[PDB]
Each structure stands twice: as structure tokens, then as C-alpha cells.
Chain A
Amino acid sequence: TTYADFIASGRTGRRASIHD
């Protein structure tokens, strides 16, 4: 499922902002 693929992925925790 899409949810299962998300939860198994590397970006499910807090996401930092970016700039450059």
C-alpha cells in the first residue's frame, strides 16, 4: 500500500528545512 511504502521510507520523522 502507499501508506506501508511511506512508513517504510527514510523520511517519516521530522523534516528539516533547506535553503542552499
Chain B
Amino acid sequence: QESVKEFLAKAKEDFLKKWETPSQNTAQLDQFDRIKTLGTGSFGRVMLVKHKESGNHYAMKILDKQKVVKLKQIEHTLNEKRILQAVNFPFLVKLEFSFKDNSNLYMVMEYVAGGEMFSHLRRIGRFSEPHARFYAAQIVLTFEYLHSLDLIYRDLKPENLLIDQQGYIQVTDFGFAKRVKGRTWTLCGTPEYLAPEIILSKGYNKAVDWWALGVLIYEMAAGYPPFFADQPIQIYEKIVSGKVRFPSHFSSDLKDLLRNLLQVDLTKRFGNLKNGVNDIKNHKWFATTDWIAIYQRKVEAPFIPKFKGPGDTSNFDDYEEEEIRVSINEKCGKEFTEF
């Protein structure tokens, strides 16, 4: 545990250099051939693209500037890019290029062809505990890294976790990521994964990421979330109650870990106690977990997506396609100066 605090210390210094002086304007749109939509969102979409000069495939997230401003999401969007360009970790998707034009913002990431954890989980139904643990361990290390940089991730869910060609996780969607040293107050996340203190408008901190990890582990192992209903308000009622029931097949160790992660009381939630992340890493459910081996990506993955080539999108759902329009007039230039 002496290797890791020295690792984190060095990690913080390269992050802070990039945080203080972000990269900008490192490619332009006509360097990419757009192939297929991989997912859509409130402000645009993510497309598979091929970089002409290298022939490499990437995932290009496209955001409409006028719509970002209209829906008051400038700070979250600037956060997303400023943080993603500054971080470096084996289970975080890599931002390779970013740029803007008259109409849009563009973030070009490594293409993670294995698809969303979400798709595989719904298809298989549920993951066995060693399978779930293999993924959970990657998130534990990743939150350890992010939180040490004073970052809060705030949208953990299987839809935002991609499976790479090695079967390892790549975290994407930094849309709500925020660098904060105090509490923060934005109601954001995804309903099933919101901690009680978010719902209750109390102010909250990084402990909400650990609550979300409890939800993720539960959903991975059960095949359904711990709190579900047809409408968010009904989901919120269940979350704040904190009553959780476990599937009969959950091990005793898993149930104990989850009781400690899905703890409504901040005072008592694992990840948020005096021993911090080590309460989690030392829990009996992770006794078989070689944390260094995971970080080094030397553990054999329980599942490897099949890919028929670079550019294969068979592990992704289909989406309706749309022309990408770029105005001949600059939109919202001042708002996105730093992008």
C-alpha cells in the first residue's frame, strides 16, 4: 500500500498539469469519415468514425452548442471535456482528439468495440459473482483514482461501461464528472443509481459514487436493480427507504458488502469511512481479488466480446441516423471559448 500512494501522488501531478492547461483543437471534422451512430443523447450523439490519415476507428461524441446553452448545461459540458482530457487510467476511455466548429463540440475517443456492459448483462441475464467481482474491482480502482484527484464521477451504470477487446472495462460518459473539494448540489445521475442524499437535496460528496457501486454490483449479480419501478418518483421512494431485498443466490459475503455500500447513512457507508477505499478492498467478498494484477490487466477476463474486425458494430444497438449540420455562422463562440 506504499506503492499506491506514491502512484496516486505522481498521478495527481500529471492530472493537475493538464487540468490547468487543457489541450484544445487537436483535429478537425473532415479528418474523419462518419460510419454509424453508437448511441444518442440529449445534445447529440456518439458515432463510429474512421480517421482518414491513420485508418484508426474512433467514437466521436458530437454536441450541439446551441442546445447545450439552451438547456443550461455549459458547465457540465466544459467539465466533461476538461476532466476527460486530463485523466489517465487503465479503465478510463481515452480522449484522442477534441475540437469545435461553428455548430458543434466534438470529443473523439478510442472506440471500444465490445459494446456496453448493459447489453451483455441484459442478454446473459445476470453475471456470476466472480464475473461481477472482476468488473467491480476495476470500478473500485477507478474511483480510488478519480476521487484522489478530487473528482466525482456521478453517472455509474452499465450503459456507461464499455467492454474492450481484452474483456476489461472502459468507463465512458464524463458528462456529470466534476472537480470539487466541498459538497455539491446538482440533481444529476440516473434514477436507479441515485444515492438518497442526492434525492433529498442535502448536498453530497464522493460517497454517492460508492452508493452507485453498490447498485451496480447488485444489478450485475441479480440482473435487475435493487430499486425499480415504472416512474422515477417511485424509484426515489424506494431508495430513500433503503429497504433492500437480496436474491436467494447472493452469497453471504456479497450481501454484507452491499449492506455496507447501500447504506443510507453517510456516516456508515463503505468508501466514506476513515479507512476509505480500503474498507472495500479488504472486504471478504474481494478476498480472491489480486488488486495489483487487475490494475496491470493480467487477470484473465471471464468474458471476451467477439469482434469481426476493426469497425465492427455488432455489439451495439442500431440508432436512427441524421445528417450532421454545420452552420456557416459561428454559434455560441464565447460560451465555449475554453473548449
Contact = CB atoms under 8 A, between A and B. Distances in A.
Interface of A: 2-3, 6-7, 9-12, 14-20
A17 B224 CA distance: 18
A19 B187 contact: yes
A10 B231 CA distance: 8
Given A9-B228, A9-B229, A12-B122, A17 B73 contact: no
A20 to B, nearest CB: 6
B230 A11 contact: yes
Contacts of B247: 2
Contact of B192 (A7, A10, A11, A19): A11
B118 A17 contact: no
A6 B235 CA distance: 12
A11 B227 CA distance: 11
A9 B188 CA distance: 23
Contact of B155 (A2, A12, A17): A17
B57 interface: no
Interface of A is mostly: loop
B175 interface: yes
Interface residues of B, number: 34
Contacts of B157: 15
Nearest to A20: B187
Contacts of A10: 230-231
A14 B228 contact: no
B230 A16 contact: no
Contacts of B155: 17
B76 A19 contact: yes
A19 B185 CA distance: 11
Contacts of A19: 73, 76, 176, 186-188
Given A3-B224, A12-B122, A18 B187 contact: yes
Interface in B295-335: 317
A2 B219 CA distance: 12
Contacts of A15: 157, 159, 190-192
A19 B39 CA distance: 19
A20 B76 CA distance: 12
Interface in B183-210: 186-192
Shortest 10 CB-CB distances between A and B: which pairs? A6-B224, A10-B230, A19-B188, A17-B190, A15-B190, A14-B159, A17-B155, A6-B228, A9-B230, A3-B224
A16 B159 CA distance: 9
Contacts of A14: 39, 116, 118, 159, 317
B227 to A, nearest CB: 11
Contacts of B116: 14
A18 B188 contact: yes
A12 B192 CA distance: 11
A16 B190 contact: yes
Nearest to B42: A16
B167 interface: no
B22 interface: no
Given A6-B224, A11-B228, A18 B159 contact: no
Interface string B224-239: 1100111110000000
Contacts of A17: 155, 173, 175-176, 188-190
B13 to A, nearest CB: 31
B189 to A, nearest CB: 7
